[PDB]
């Protein structure tokens, strides 16, 4: 078709970012793979 993207102008008295609220989010492990690690005395210590 086509898409024209327009930002709407907000009421300055309304709570801006009506989705915004303090929340805790536990985040998963990132997608990139694992790097290789590449590396008598017990009676003393």
């Amino acid at each position: 078709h086509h898409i024209e993207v327009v930002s709407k102008q907000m009421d300055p008295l309304l709570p801006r970012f009506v989705g915004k609220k303090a929340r805790k989010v536990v985040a998963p492990t990132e997608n990139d793979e694992v790097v290789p690690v590449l590396h008598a005395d017990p009676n003393e210590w």
């Binding site: 492990t29 694992v34 290789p36 690690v37 590449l38 590396h39």
Partner: protein
């Protein structure tokens, strides 16, 4: 069944309430993993072993018991392509190379150890490893 179902519900709150405050204590990760193995649930048990490799991935008694979880139930390719991660993580560790050899010895295919020792001698280990070859 609810004699067992609320049993399984109650135990999972007790171990994960503890691991919440102690991400460390690798002994509790293994014990809580072994509980889910005995429930005949390998989907949940593999999750706990993957979640525990995130906390430490150099504690190789965690690695070995996750191979033992896979071979006792005789799921073989999950323990095979695991080793594409395990020794590509820690190439210097002796026991991770030895265990993936001797398990292949009991599965009797010596075409596979013909390519394992190929890399493991290109890697220049040292005297105790060259002599077993």
């Amino acid at each position: 069944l609810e004699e067992l179902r609320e049993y399984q519900r109650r135990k999972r709150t007790e171990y994960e309430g503890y691991l919440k405050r102690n991400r460390l204590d690798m002994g509790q990760w293994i014990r809580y993993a072994q509980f889910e193995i005995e429930q005949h649930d390998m989907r949940r048990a593999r999750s706990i072993f993957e979640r525990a490799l995130l906390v430490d991935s150099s504690f190789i008694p965690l690695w070995i018991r996750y191979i033992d979880a896979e071979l006792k139930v005789k799921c073989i390719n999950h323990a095979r392509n695991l080793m594409n991660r395990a020794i590509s993580t820690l190439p210097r560790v002796d026991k991770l190379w030895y265990k993936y050899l001797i398990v292949e010895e009991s599965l009797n295919n010596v075409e596979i150890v013909r390519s394992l020792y190929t890399k493991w001698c290109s890697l220049e280990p040292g005297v105790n490893a060259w002599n077993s070859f």
